Design an enzyme around this catalytic site. Sequence first.
Site, short mmCIF file in Angstrom:
data_model
loop_
_atom_site.label_atom_id
_atom_site.label_comp_id
_atom_site.label_asym_id
_atom_site.label_seq_id
_atom_site.Cartn_x
_atom_site.Cartn_y
_atom_site.Cartn_z
NE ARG A 1 -2.34 0.03 -6.13
CZ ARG A 1 -2.41 -0.49 -7.68
NH1 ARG A 1 -1.94 -0.61 -8.54
NH2 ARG A 1 -4.01 0.48 -8.11
CB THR B 1 -11.75 1.90 -23.99
OG1 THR B 1 -11.05 1.31 -23.19
CG2 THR B 1 -11.11 3.00 -24.07
CG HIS C 1 -13.82 0.28 -3.62
ND1 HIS C 1 -13.47 -0.49 -4.72
CD2 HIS C 1 -14.89 -0.60 -4.03
CE1 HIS C 1 -14.97 -1.07 -5.58
NE2 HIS C 1 -15.26 -1.87 -4.75
CD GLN D 1 -14.01 -0.05 -10.55
OE1 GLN D 1 -13.16 -0.68 -9.99
NE2 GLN D 1 -14.20 0.40 -11.41
CB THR E 1 -16.77 0.62 -15.42
OG1 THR E 1 -16.86 -0.53 -15.18
CG2 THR E 1 -17.55 1.37 -14.69
CB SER E 2 -19.43 -2.37 -19.05
OG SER E 2 -19.89 -3.40 -18.05
CE1 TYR F 1 -3.58 -2.93 -0.03
CE2 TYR F 1 -4.29 -1.08 -0.94
CZ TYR F 1 -4.77 -1.68 -0.22
OH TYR F 1 -5.83 -2.78 -1.44
CB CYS G 1 -5.33 5.55 20.48
SG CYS G 1 -5.12 4.51 19.29
ZN LIG Z 1 -6.13 5.15 17.49
#
Ligand SMILES: [Zn+2]
Lengths: 259, 258
Positions: A70, A241, A123, A105, A215-216, A67, A177
């Site tokens: 990403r 496309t 998402h 999305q 998208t479709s 990630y 925390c």
């Molecule tokens: Zn926390």
Amino acid sequence: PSSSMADFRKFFAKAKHIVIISGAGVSAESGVPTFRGAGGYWRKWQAQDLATPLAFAHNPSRVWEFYHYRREVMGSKEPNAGHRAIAECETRLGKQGRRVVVITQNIDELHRKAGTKNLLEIHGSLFKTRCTSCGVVAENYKSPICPALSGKGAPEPGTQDASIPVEKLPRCEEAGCGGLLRPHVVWFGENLDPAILEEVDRELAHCDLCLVVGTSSVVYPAAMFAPQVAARGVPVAEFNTERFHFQGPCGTTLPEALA
Amino acid sequence: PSSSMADFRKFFAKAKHIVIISGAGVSAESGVPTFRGAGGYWRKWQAQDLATPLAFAHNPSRVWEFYHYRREVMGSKEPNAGHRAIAECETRLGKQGRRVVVITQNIDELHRKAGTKNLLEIHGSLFKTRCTSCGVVAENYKSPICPALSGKGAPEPGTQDASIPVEKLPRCEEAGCGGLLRPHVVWFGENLDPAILEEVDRELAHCDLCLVVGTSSVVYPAAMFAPQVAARGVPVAEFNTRFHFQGPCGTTLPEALA
Ligand SMILES: [Zn+2]
Ligand SMILES: [Zn+2]
């Protein structure tokens, strides 16, 4: 499915509430590498090896490495002409009391950077974190997200695992925390946020025009939404496309269609 | 957009791996009540009102009354000529080295009553429960599911809410649990079991021929299944209430799967 731009532009002129369902094609047109099919690979693994709560439990360092990768590839990208047309339409129509909502999305925030304000991110976002202890959702655009991930996340198989102890992965900064952070992204097995789906369903119930872009409507997630709008007699215009179907990059078709 | 039965049989006679997507139309022809559309009401509501996590959290008694009604009406329902032909086709092709599998979001179990064995009930069952505490999945055909639902579940509006306290709704009978049961059925706003859809995809990716029978455009995710089979170049034959065959599935399917 008609390809008449003139016939589409007639509904568009009169439409008061437009729902735009935005798929990965929109993000890909900005150079975002689509993590599906042949592209759904990082080192030795697929998405179902990485993007799961079980994966994060067993090896959070590896999941965070991915990630971080990403986030690194995403934060260098820019909204394209399609993103811009979509935002400019929302702004323009909004001054007339007409509504545009985007359901995406995608998790790169490119719609947000383009100026989209009515934005539903089903998402989540990889520039948001969630604390596994306190549950706080926070914005995080920091490069790198934590010092231990500096220079990490290379996609080549054979790249050594960073093997960063959990204590050195991204931690919550809420006072007292210190919990382990995860990406604020919907993973396999996890449900979409009920509050978001609630908002989504309300928009679909009220819209008088629906767009599916990059998208479709026969594929997840547009397949969740477009069929019930269409079954209500609301026009559905599809831009991709390969009622309305407009072929080509959204960066080419949307500027004209949403003018 | 073919409507020729002669062209379908040519594909059917040689087909090794047949997927049959079975929609609500197949159930409707047996008199199973549907809960979408104008004729799809229980009291004041349709499935989109009742078959949700929110509804169950806010009024589990009303949601249980609804599924209790649906459990109880099944007692007069039988599989139709469509279910039978599908089930006979499976056993027939079995002794020939060929696969018939049924994938369905129908939760009334008429396919398994009819003798279907390769059955994917991807939306669970009216006759299964799930504990909201321990997660245990149990078969339940008990009539009534709990004593507090005795005589309840009336379908006409104006029918007073049972208002059964949660303690008297179906309770988990696993030792020391006592948790609240829900029907083991997929609700609006809920994903399928991860393994279930992975198994659907496997059947879809390996099939030589797809049948799609009595399925609406808004049934989900089942409406995505035939599209991706067709994208492969594999023939998809539509049986509604590439091929299109019109009429009751109990009227068209026996001759099509003959
Ligand atoms: Zn926390
Ligand atoms: Zn239990």
